[PDB]
């Protein structure tokens, strides 16, 4: 998971919110450097940075295009980069670093650090849930959207279903990002482009003989009556001239941002929305189970790489927007690398990922259990 | 567990093309009744299109991972009794060997 | 139970069935809205026999209901009883008939009485499955006898 | 019990009633298209 980080990922995370009114190109990372006052710079080592309470980190340079050093990366032990990977028995012994070792730790300000595996509800998947007895909504289908490698937009979607079994008007409404209320799926489907029902129902039903679901959709379709075009369809997302743009925007950048936030794919997005309102009614009609949440295949484990990613990102961006600070003074080389390294250190040695701000998860980087090999 | 490992993360591209060059009706131009029991196709949680005769698709991709052409990690299922094909190139899925 | 009747295996049910809150909704397989303008004949074959019998203003908007047959013996009832109820429930502003515990298909039909009908009939579609009772007192669900 | 929509603008249909002929009369409320009963069967429930 660390290999994968340095190899490919590190290149990526320096290319996205890169350039400015100056570009960042290719990437150079070194084997452990240790840099001290009184002496050149030593080919740092496990033993050494351990006994001397240093950081087993190393060099992070990027080809600046108008080649440049910015910070150090606490390299993982026994990785690709670590002097140790290649070595063998006799050498290990000779280095004093143990043979029977297995690797994996980091070595910040001396001690042996380890990162805590992070279980999480596998992002980007459709799910369907019932609500409690007293509740406006009987059912809701949710989807968390999160760009896999950029801005980690965790904007999300509740697709509801008012009125408990029986009560009149099983009206359907869904909730968007940057959006005050809950739009009845009609307006949405129409602002998306696909304007007439019967067609709307083609996105939603894959069998014209499902008189059941068909039926259900009716009161909603009747909800939307009061607007029929892709103009007022976005006008009533106003929360003039302005609002009809506010919306258009919000629908190509904030709506189901995973899939595509680009442009001409209303066809694809609406069809997904379709499949969602479908799934919702699959369960409103006890046809398929409320989605099992403690399903292991449905959860992912944030490891080294990904942690280094979140971190390296929300960190470096704080630098990118420092560049503009030293530049906008240019009424006419100041790339303070201390932040990039003292950050990695900070969060690593402590456990507070979201910088220093206690509003980050204090728990990761439990410091290696050295009691017995088993442990 | 001992055998278990974490998924690293593969690229979606050369599998997306590897698929649309096999039967991928782009979600763009779908025909609700024309394509009746259309086994719809997903990836990382995204609807990339639809394919006819699924069994073929499957046996194909299977002895395609079994040679290496597709990362032997990334996984995908056909939910028979739902005519769906979920594809997962994700990073975070625990897996074992069999 | 009561002082004397203590080993009264039937007295048991005699009271089970005097509280075990039964509602219309417990016996109703389906509710259909038909359009029958003729105040004297259903456009349905199965619903003919019971027409010409309940003869021996309204509205052309018909409301038909089916009652599960087993749902008439886990709470031992009768189409007649139910009719009695609905009748005493809305009372005078709707005409209604019902087949017979006989007929292989248990069926109730109900019209209206004196601008937008098939939006009113609906209000009174739920107004009946959930707000109408048969026997028993509020809250009391599953109710079983024990020795 | 399957239902339908209008040609012209393919939108949903809402029933009406011929006051003189006593017929079922599905009509559109976006344009003017109308039509007759395929069946007096309007809405079924089933639980
Ligand atoms: Zn029309």
UniProtKB/Swiss-Prot annotation, chain A:
Residues 354-363 are annotated as: Fork loop 1. It comes from the Eukaryota. GO terms for biological process: RNA-templated transcription; transcription by RNA polymerase II; transcription elongation by RNA polymerase II; transcription initiation at RNA polymerase II promoter. GO terms for molecular function: DNA binding; DNA-directed RNA polymerase activity; mRNA binding; ribonucleoside binding; zinc ion binding. The keyword Iron does not apply. It is found in: Nucleus. GO terms for cellular component: cytoplasmic stress granule; mitochondrion; nucleus; RNA polymerase II, core complex. The keyword Nucleus applies. Keywords: DNA-directed RNA polymerase, Magnesium, Metal-binding, Nucleotidyltransferase, Nucleus, Phosphoprotein, Transcription, Transferase, Zinc, Zinc-finger. Component of the RNA polymerase II (Pol II) complex consisting of 12 subunits. The binding of ribonucleoside triphosphate to the RNA polymerase II transcribing complex probably involves a two-step mechanism. The initial binding seems to occur at the entry (E) site and involves a magnesium ion coordinated by three conserved aspartate residues of the two largest RNA Pol II subunits. Belongs to the RNA polymerase beta chain family. This is DNA-directed RNA polymerase II subunit RPB2. It comes from Saccharomyces cerevisiae (strain ATCC 204508 / S288c) (Baker's yeast). The chain holds residues 50 to 490 of 1224 of the full protein.
Curated annotation (Swiss-Prot), chain B:
It is found in: Nucleus. It comes from the Eukaryota. The binding of ribonucleoside triphosphate to the RNA polymerase II transcribing complex probably involves a two-step mechanism. The initial binding seems to occur at the entry (E) site and involves a magnesium ion coordinated by three conserved aspartate residues of the two largest RNA Pol II subunits. Component of the RNA polymerase II (Pol II) complex consisting of 12 subunits. DNA-dependent RNA polymerase catalyzes the transcription of DNA into RNA using the four ribonucleoside triphosphates as substrates. Second largest component of RNA polymerases II which synthesizes mRNA precursors and many functional non-coding RNAs. Proposed to contribute to the polymerase catalytic activity and forms the polymerase active center together with the largest subunit. Pol II is the central component of the basal RNA polymerase II transcription machinery. Belongs to the RNA polymerase beta chain family. This is DNA-directed RNA polymerase II subunit RPB2. The chain holds residues 540 to 637 of 1224 of the full protein.
UniProtKB/Swiss-Prot annotation, chain C:
It is found in: Nucleus. The tandem 7 residues repeats in the C-terminal domain (CTD) can be highly phosphorylated. The phosphorylation activates Pol II. Phosphorylation occurs mainly at residues 'Ser-2' and 'Ser-5' of the heptapeptide repeat. The phosphorylated form of Pol II appears to carry, on average, one phosphate per repeat. The phosphorylation state is believed to result from the balanced action of site-specific CTD kinases and phosphatases, and a 'CTD code' that specifies the position of Pol II within the transcription cycle has been proposed. Belongs to the RNA polymerase beta' chain family. Component of the RNA polymerase II (Pol II) complex consisting of 12 subunits. Interacts with DEF1; the interaction is direct and serves to bridge RPB1 to the Elongin complex in a DNA-damaged dependent manner. Interacts with the Elongin subunit ELA1. Interacts with the Elongin subunit ELC1. Interacts with ASK10. Interacts with ESS1. Interacts with RTT103. Interacts with SHE2. The C-terminal domain (CTD) serves as a platform for assembly of factors that regulate transcription initiation, elongation, termination and mRNA processing. This is DNA-directed RNA polymerase II subunit RPB1. It comes from Saccharomyces cerevisiae (strain ATCC 204508 / S288c). The chain holds residues 1120 to 1286 of 1733 of the full protein.
From Swiss-Prot, chain D:
Belongs to the archaeal RpoM/eukaryotic RPA12/RPB9/RPC11 RNA polymerase family. A zinc finger (C4-type) spans 6-31. Present with 2440 molecules/cell in log phase SD medium. It comes from the Eukaryota. The modification Phosphoserine is found at residue 39. The lineage of its organism: Eukaryota, Fungi, Dikarya, Ascomycota, Saccharomycotina. Zn(2+) 1 binds at residues 6, 9, 28, 31. Component of the RNA polymerase II (Pol II) complex consisting of 12 subunits. The chain holds residues 2 to 48 of 122 of the full protein. It is found in: Nucleus, Nucleolus. This is DNA-directed RNA polymerase II subunit RPB9. DNA-dependent RNA polymerase catalyzes the transcription of DNA into RNA using the four ribonucleoside triphosphates as substrates. Component of RNA polymerase II which synthesizes mRNA precursors and many functional non-coding RNAs. Pol II is the central component of the basal RNA polymerase II transcription machinery. It is composed of mobile elements that move relative to each other. RPB9 is part of the upper jaw surrounding the central large cleft and thought to grab the incoming DNA template. Involved in the regulation of transcription elongation.
